[PDB]
Every structure is written in C-alpha cells, then in structure tokens.
Nucleic acid binder design. Structure first.
Lengths: 206, 60, 149
RNA sequence: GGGAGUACGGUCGCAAGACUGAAACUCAAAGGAAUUGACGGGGGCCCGCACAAGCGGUGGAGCAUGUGGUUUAAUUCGAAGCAACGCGAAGAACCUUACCAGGUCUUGACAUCCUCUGACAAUCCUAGAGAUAGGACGUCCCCUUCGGGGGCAGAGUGACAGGUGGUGCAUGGUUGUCGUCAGCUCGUGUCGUGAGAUGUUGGGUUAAGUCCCGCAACGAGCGCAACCCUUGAUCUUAGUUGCCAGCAUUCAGUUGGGCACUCUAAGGUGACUGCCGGUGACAAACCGGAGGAAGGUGGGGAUGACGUCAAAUCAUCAUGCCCCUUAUGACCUGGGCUACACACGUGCUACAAUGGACAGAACAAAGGGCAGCGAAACCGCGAGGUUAAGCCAAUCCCACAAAUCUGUUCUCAGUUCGGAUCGCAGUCUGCAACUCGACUGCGUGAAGCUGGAAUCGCUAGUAAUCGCGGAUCAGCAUGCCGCG
RNA sequence: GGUCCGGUAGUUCAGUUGGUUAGAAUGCCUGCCUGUCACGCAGGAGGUCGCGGGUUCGAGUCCCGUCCGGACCGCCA
C-alpha cells in the first residue's frame, strides 16, 4: 500500500492540466492525438531533454508550448530543425500547428529533468550512491526547500533488489498547499530494470 | 499474443456485431470508458500525469 | 467512552397530560411510520367500547402492572455462570415493559393486530396476561437468586 | 560441552548407596552479564459496533452469481484466513477467447531496412469457412532543366516481427494488509566500553509524539492537525431555458410584465475556545452557560508515516533461458469458459392479514440523451410496432419515483401467500437466441408456514425498508457505482 | 474322539427371552468451531443377523445338520 501521486492529487487546485483545451464530441480523438504528439516530441527530443509540454486548441488549430533551456539551444542551430520537426506534427495532426519554446531557468529544481539526469547517470554505469547524493545537494544549493529522491531495482547486488532513498530538507506531502513537483523515470541496465522517483518542495501557494 | 488481434480490432470485421472495443493506448479489451476509449490502468496513469483536460480527483 | 442519551416523540410542552401526550405522540415502536399512528388510535376506541371508562386509564394501569422492579443478568465466575440480580433504571423500566407488551402482542395470535394488542392491554390491566406472566417469572427468578448481590 | 559423576577396579555400608574416578566416540560450540524487540493463562493505564445493551440478518427452501471437487476434447488462465471465493470480468451466442476438434499460411495481420511496378484498390460471379481458380472497369498521385526524387500501395527479398509461453523468490510501475492506528526517525550534544540509552521518559491532557510543566538534553524531519472538496445560515452580483409576491388572462404562472421569493454559481461572512462562571497552580486543558444556522476536530469525503507479510500482478514492462518462425507464431468454421453425482462463499425472492388483490389520491432526487434521447396520437389486453413533434439539452425526452394515504373484497389454510420448474403462443435485438439472452400472454403451480451447532452489519437521517438513475453497451444486472 | 457354549453395524457388546420392532458405544461422513490440526458442538448412513434345511400367520431370537472357533473330559491296569 503506497502513496497517492502528489501532482496527481494537486492537479486542478494548485496545478493546471497541461492540456488546456475544451472539447465535446471530439474529446476522445483530441486526447488521442495529444498523446500521440506528446509521445513523438518526447521521443525525438529526449536527447535535448524536455520536462513538460502543454497543448492548446483554437479553431481546430493546435498550438504547443515546450519547456527547458536546451530547446533554447534548439532555437538557434535547430531553428531550421524546429520547422523541420513541426512539419511532422503538421503531417500527423492533419491541420497545421504552432509552437513556442519557454526556457526553464534553474533546471536543478524541475522534477522530470532531475529524474532524467539520474536515469542517465545510472545507465552510463555510475553508482547510485554518488549520483543521488550529489544531485540532492545540487538541487538544494540551487535553492529548493526540500528534496526526497528514491531509486529501486537490482541496485548492483544483482541477485536481489531493494529500495533506497536520500533526503535533506522539509517536504510535506500530506499538506494540500505545498508545491511538491513530482516526476519519475525508468532506467534500463544490463543487470535488470531501474526506476527513479524524485520530488522537490519548492514552496507553498497563496 | 496481442499484436494480431489489436490489428483485428483495427480492421473492420465481417459483421457490425464483431467490432468489440479495445483500449487504444494500452491494448486491454476489458473495462474501457467510451468517453475516452481508454481503460483504467493507462487512464489513471495519464490522469495523474495531468492530461484529460477536464477531470480531477473527485471528493464529496 | 461515557453515558449518552436522547429524547424524542415529544408532545407539546404546556397544558399536556399523558393521555394527549400519547394521543399525539409517543410509543409506536412497532416499525416504520404508518402501520402505526394507525393499527393504533383505534385499538384505544375498541376498548372504550369494551370498558365503560376512559380507554387511556387502562393503558398505563396495565403498564404499571407489567413494570418489573428487579431483574437478573449473567456474569462469568469460575465455572458456574451465576445469575446476578440487579435493579432497573427509570427509563430501562419503561422501555423493556413496553417492549414486552408489543412483542407479545405480535406473538399471541388472533384475527388481527389491533384486537390482539387491545386484548393484551386488558389482560395486563387485569393481572393475567402473557407479558405479565414473563414479568413474574423474571421476578421469581430474581429473588430466588437474590443472594448474589 | 556431551559421553558421565556413568563404565571398570578398589575402600566403606546390612542395604539403599557414598568416596576415589578413565576411556572410545562425537560437536564447534556449550556458557556469564548486559542490550534491543517479541511474547506471558504477568502487572498498571487507555482506545475501537470489540464486548455488553437493541434492530435486522446469514445458513432451513427456491433461484442469481463466485469458488472447491468431479467431468470432459476443452471446461483458457490469475486469485486461496483475516487481507481469495456478484474477485481480474464497468457484461462470454460469434466476436471477447488464450483453450479444444477440424480445415489452412509462412519475412508472416502487425514494424524498419533492400530491388522492382508504377499511385493502388473495390464491386459482383462458382466451391466458399478461411482462402484460393479465374474473371467483367478491372492495379488510374505531388514535384520534376524529365535525371530522378516525395508518398502511396502491390510483388520478391534476408536481416527480422510473435510470443495472454515460464519465472511477482530477477524487477520496474502499481495495489491490499496491520491502519487513519499513533507512532517512526535523524542533526548536535551527553552517559556507557559495547550492544546501546537520552531526546521519544515522568503530571495531567486530548483522538492524537495534542499541549503545557519538569527533565542532559537542545532542535529538526515524516506522521496528527490544518491548508482541499462537499452539506449545513446569510450578504453582494447575476435574473434565462428558472421563479411567478401583486395584477389581466388561461387547461398549457404557458403569456403580458418583474427578479419580489426559491433556485442557480462566483466572491465574502461565518465557529475561532471567541466570551461569562466553575474546576484545574494562573499553565495546558476539562465542565456548565449564553449568544448562535451551526460549540468544542458541527457532519461526511479526499489525504494512508517507517515498514511486515519473498502478500498479489511477467495479462502495461524488461536482462534471463528455452518455442520457433514448414511452430507454443498466425487466419477461418464449430464447441467453452454456462458441464453437474456433491461442498462452501456472497446475494435476490418468499414463508403472510402490520398481508394479497382491485380502484382512487398523492409527494419527487441525482444523472443520461446525436449511428442519441426519442413526444403526441393510432395498432396490440403484451412484450412492442406504425408514423414520428421537440431536444445538442435549468427549454425537449429519458421520466406516469414506489413505499405511503383513502376505500371494496378476501377470513387463516400450504391459502387469492409463495412463485420455482415446466408445455403452448408471441415481442425485441442481433446474419445468428439448440448448447447459450431478456421480456411478455396462457396453462401451470414446487419447496417453504421463521430455520440446529454456530455466525454477521449497524451508534440517528444510521440500520430497516422503498424505489430512481448510471459505467460496462445493439441484447444481456438479484452484481457494482451513485441518488433520494 | 466325546459333552457344553456361543458366531450379530467396519470394530466391541446388547436384542439373542418377548416367534409378530434389529439396537448401544466406537469408527466413518457433512457442517460449525480453530490461523491449521486435535478436543469439542450439531446433525447422518449402515448391518437385515456364520452357512444350509425344516415347523409357523410369522423365525434374528424355535428344531435340525454343516463350518468356525472357545470351555470341560479323555481314567483303572
């Protein structure tokens, strides 16, 4: 018996859906193509890294906003590449699309980016101890109020798995006023499967 | 054996009866909700993630 | 834990006698509303006919007749399960006696409910009724085991 | 440490036995004290529908459903005390569906690569179930300084695809359980030598590790509370598809007119121990008042700590092995998961007059409705059918809530209760109702007349009854979810 | 070899006498209880009477023989 997802609980009261469009009688296919474009862009931008992408609807014209500073580097050199990929989104959606790039300053306190960092450090053969203990203090001095991070799977001791987590700070999950951002990521290793769960207390909301 | 009969579901059958419904994101045949064409496991997943613009964890 | 209680089936506060207390409220402990406030209020008139006096007076007279003043509960001691006499609270008195009247009314068996109940009300106004019978059996049990405090 | 204070030989004793006292063999422990948990038919406190005190139930009968056993060709697999057994399944005639019989295919429905044909398909014919034999038009784009590219399918093609095939004791990710219980920890410092202790104990306090007071402890963190939702009183704004106070009108408070009132949905007010008396050191708090729609976390929901159960899931996911791709991978027809000598679990219907039957009179949620909801009228005594108005919905419809109240008959029976199971005749859906739907008109009418030993839920809108919707979806609800 | 006994549920004993009825414990089966088992609590089936023959309206239970075992005797020179 495990905990409820914190952002899962906080959606709609202190968090927006990250899909801000109304539909009716088109809800199913709008939703489906939303998942399709999410999957496509996440797959093909994983190397550049991106946390969260919102979708917006107007006159049957989809429009997007995409996060993280690295797609900032995709603006300049990939400015041709931005048009090249959004051509694919046009082809998929049928009707043409608009996009926007928003830069997440201070990436050390984005849950998904942190999770992807941990996943990469794990998959290129670095020890969970070094990776996790370094990342927690990185985020803390980046200026979070509290962090708890956790990894699970066959943690080196391949013959049996276990769980482990570090944390330092204040992190209330039961309070429905905090801004506990949450993410999780999956890391595939030779000796099994590794999963990551990281969340950070940014601050309350008023 | 899943790919073969998800493809069956995709293609039209020989009668209007046979076209049962399978969830589209994750191919479970049982317990789809028509309003999303989605079944509970991969429905709850993206529900907690944030998608499905209008729905929230209910309480009353 | 701690004591708890409630009041209900309340008649009006002032210029109220027991007779109209029940004629507008009270008792009725037989089931859901309806089939009570009915199958009753008419039991009383049939005994207005059957006795040349106020049909209410016989009611609480029979009630007084049925009331116990001691009874016995069970306690685990050694291997005997001694039967220990105890007293009855002023409200426990009324609830249990009323209970005996109603359940025996639905046990005795005749053509129909209101005549059953009325016949028992008079058989308890006189001291020869089934509920009164259990009253004296509980009583003789109790002071036959009076010794146990 | 056992072997054993036993064996043998002696000295004692009348005897029981006492003193002296080997060995072979065998084990890597046997032990002392302290430490932390667990546990006791140990103690001291405190809690919980835990028990008492009440209501109604479960098993006794019929049936609905799940499970065990048996049965088959198959009865697809998973689940196994609480915490599995109206559970995965929010729906099995085919489909689902994996399993069984038969008939069939091989780079394979599905995905990327390689070379061609260029845009490729669909309808209809006999065998027909796949599919194949062939047909009648019968393989027909965008850009190209025309070389050839882009996408679209078809053919061949070797790499490959497939695994609801195993392994939850390889895992992720999820979920139950103790448990909404009040605990669980760390920083620094002290004491011990060390396992360790303190804080976290002692007084009361509450639901609480809640608070206050002491205290080698001082603090912090996760838990509790609150922050969230929702129902309870009201202020402002808004009056249409709502509401009609006063008026004229009507059977259609529909109209005319107006937001008066309800109601609707946003923003505030609100209850915060706030105030008074007492108890308590004055503290924390507790008791009683008043105001108050609401007084002491008002009610309910959401929230589920560190962790135990190698708890469940390889059926979303992936190392690991094997199955091969002329087979455990695939397509089609039919059968099954619904079998039935019995056993158990969870439910519905009753066993009757606080009732049956007939007639009249009522009161009303929260939801759903566009391959939808489907009005009115007509047809049928019925399930329904005909032709269909309005409604993308505070307008239309689903939708005539039942229990209940009133009145007539029935007169205690296996009965006008009960309605099981049966033959006949129909309606609906679906290509399709034998295995294997539901509903209806007849005829039928079974067991059952309060259920052993045992056992369960419930602290007031609860239990008990009464209906009404809704997911699953053509049809399939005594189940589940929700509403009054 | 003679005399006397008996022979019953799966096991042990009543009935076997009452010519006109097949019973009591244990075992076994189902359910409950317990986390499971064992106790324990509810319920339930059984033999149709060693074998064969005969009397009788009727044989388990009466009379015969056969099998089975068990008790007693089998002595005098």
């Amino acid at each position: 018996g495990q905990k409820v997802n914190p952002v899962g609980l906080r959606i709609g009261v202190i968090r927006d859906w990250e899909s801000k469009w109304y539909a009716g009688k088109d809800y199913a296919d709008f939703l489906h193509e939303d998942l399709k474009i999410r999957e496509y862009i996440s797959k093909r931008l994983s190397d550049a890294s991106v946390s969260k992408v919102e979708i917006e609807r107007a006159a049957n014209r989809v429009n997007i906003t995409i996060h993280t500073a690295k797609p900032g580097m995709v603006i300049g050199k990939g400015g041709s590449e931005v048009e090249a990929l959004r051509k694919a989104l046009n082809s998929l959606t049928g009707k043409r699309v608009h996009i926007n790039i928003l830069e997440i300053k201070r990436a050390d306190l984005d849950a998904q980016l942190v999770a992807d960092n941990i996943a990469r450090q794990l998959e290129n053969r670095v020890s969970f101890r070094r990776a996790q203990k370094q990342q927690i203090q990185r985020t803390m001095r980046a200026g979070a109020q509290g962090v708890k991070t956790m990894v699970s799977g066959r943690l080196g001791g391949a013959d049996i798995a276990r769980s482990e987590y570090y944390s330092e700070g204040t992190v209330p999950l039961h309070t429905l006023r905090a801004d506990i951002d949450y993410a999780t990521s999956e890391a595939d290793t030779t000796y099994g499967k590794l999963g990551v769960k990281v969340w950070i207390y940014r601050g309350e909301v008023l | 054996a899943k790919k073969s009969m998800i493809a069956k579901q995709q293609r039209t059958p020989k009668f209007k009866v046979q076209e049962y419904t399978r969830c589209e994101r994750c191919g479970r045949p049982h317990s789809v909700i028509r309003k999303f064409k989605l079944c509970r496991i991969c429905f709850r997943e993206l529900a907690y993630k944030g998608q499905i613009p209008g729905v929230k964890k209910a309480s009353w | 834990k701690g004591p708890v209680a409630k009041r209900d089936v309340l008649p009006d506060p002032i210029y109220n006698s027991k007779l109209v207390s029940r004629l507008i409220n009270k008792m009725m402990i037989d089931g859901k509303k309806g089939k009570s406030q009915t199958i009753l209020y008419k039991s009383f008139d049939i005994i207005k006919e059957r006795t040349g006096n106020d049909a209410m007076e016989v009611f609480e007279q029979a009630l007084k007749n049925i009331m116990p003043v001691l009874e016995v509960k069970a306690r685990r001691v050694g291997g005997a399960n001694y039967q220990v006499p105890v007293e009855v609270r002023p409200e426990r008195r009324t609830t249990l006696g009323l209970r005996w009247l109603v359940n025996y009314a639905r046990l005795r068996g005749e053509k129909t409910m209101e005549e059953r109940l009325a016949n028992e009300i008079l058989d308890a106004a006189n001291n020869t009724g089934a509920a009164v019978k259990k009253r004296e059996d509980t009583h003789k049990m109790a002071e036959a085991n009076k010794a146990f405090a």
